[PDB]
Amino acid sequence: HHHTDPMVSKGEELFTGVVPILVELDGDVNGHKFSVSGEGEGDATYGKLTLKFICTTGKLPVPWPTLVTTLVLCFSRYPDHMKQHDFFKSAMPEGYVQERTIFFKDDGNYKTRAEVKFEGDTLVNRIELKGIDFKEDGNILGHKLEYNYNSHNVYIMADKQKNGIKSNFKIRHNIEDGSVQLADHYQQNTPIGDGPVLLPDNHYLSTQSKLSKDPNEKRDHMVLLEFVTAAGITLG
Numbered sequence: 001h002h003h004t005d006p007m008v009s010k011g012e013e014l015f016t017g018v019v020p021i022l023v024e025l026d027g028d029v030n031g032h033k034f035s036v037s038g039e040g041e042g043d044a045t046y047g048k049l050t051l052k053f054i055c056t057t058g059k060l061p062v063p064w065p066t067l068v069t070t071l072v073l074c075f076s077r078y079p080d081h082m083k084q085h086d087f088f089k090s091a092m093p094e095g096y097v098q099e100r101t102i103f104f105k106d107d108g109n110y111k112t113r114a115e116v117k118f119e120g121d122t123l124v125n126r127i128e129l130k131g132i133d134f135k136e137d138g139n140i141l142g143h144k145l146e147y148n149y150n151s152h153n154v155y156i157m158a159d160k161q162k163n164g165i166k167s168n169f170k171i172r173h174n175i176e177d178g179s180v181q182l183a184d185h186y187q188q189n190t191p192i193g194d195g196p197v198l199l200p201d202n203h204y205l206s207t208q209s210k211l212s213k214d215p216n217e218k219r220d221h222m223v224l225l226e227f228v229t230a231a232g233i234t235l236g
Helices: 006-014 080-085
Strands: 019-029 032-043 048-055 096-104 109-119 122-132 152-159 164-174 180-191 203-212 221-231
Touching (some): 019 048
Parallel strands (some): 019 122
Antiparallel strands (some): 019 032, 032 048, 096 180, 109 122, 152 164, 203 221
16 A cells, blocks of 8 residues: 555555466476466465365376465565565566475475466466476375475575575475475575566565365365465564
8 A cells, every 4th residue: 555665555556455366387296297277366465365276187196285385475464564575576567486496305306487477467376397206105196195284484585696585494294194294495586577676684474374175176176275474574
């Protein structure tokens, strides 16, 4: 809405109210090719995303929880006193590229590249995923992960040379036997457009995700409720 900085006002304008989301992923893990399509809606005022994903090629060859971070940080709630640090909305509507390498400890790695931008009124996240060096009997290709997701906090830093941001963080996936599978994430984001963006001071995003199933859905799928809030810079 009403912010003294017109660059902040421009990005906030695009995310006031509920915004529809489309997610489209094409993936290849150890030569198992698959596609995922997701639909839902984001409400940046509360940091809230509701999405349902479907594997459109049949059975997903990897566990759904390993794709949560890959399958839209512009819907994060930034407190008023931090809105000058919201890179993700400032890059819109032209969008940004989000690249990751995700290393699964003692297993394979995912490399992802995504473009996040508006098509009309719809926020689209278009992802390519390549996964290599997985063990056919490991926790990933073996489907030994529980269907759930732990809350965590992630630190965001500016990358002033790329006019973007970078982040590195660990996700712990629960294994069915009570142990944990570590997923080390390395992330960078860069704007698609040439115009100015907001480069943030160091801060973190607090994330909580709930995974569920649609009782009427026969296709392989995941229902996701995610909350993401920015924090780590104090008001006064």
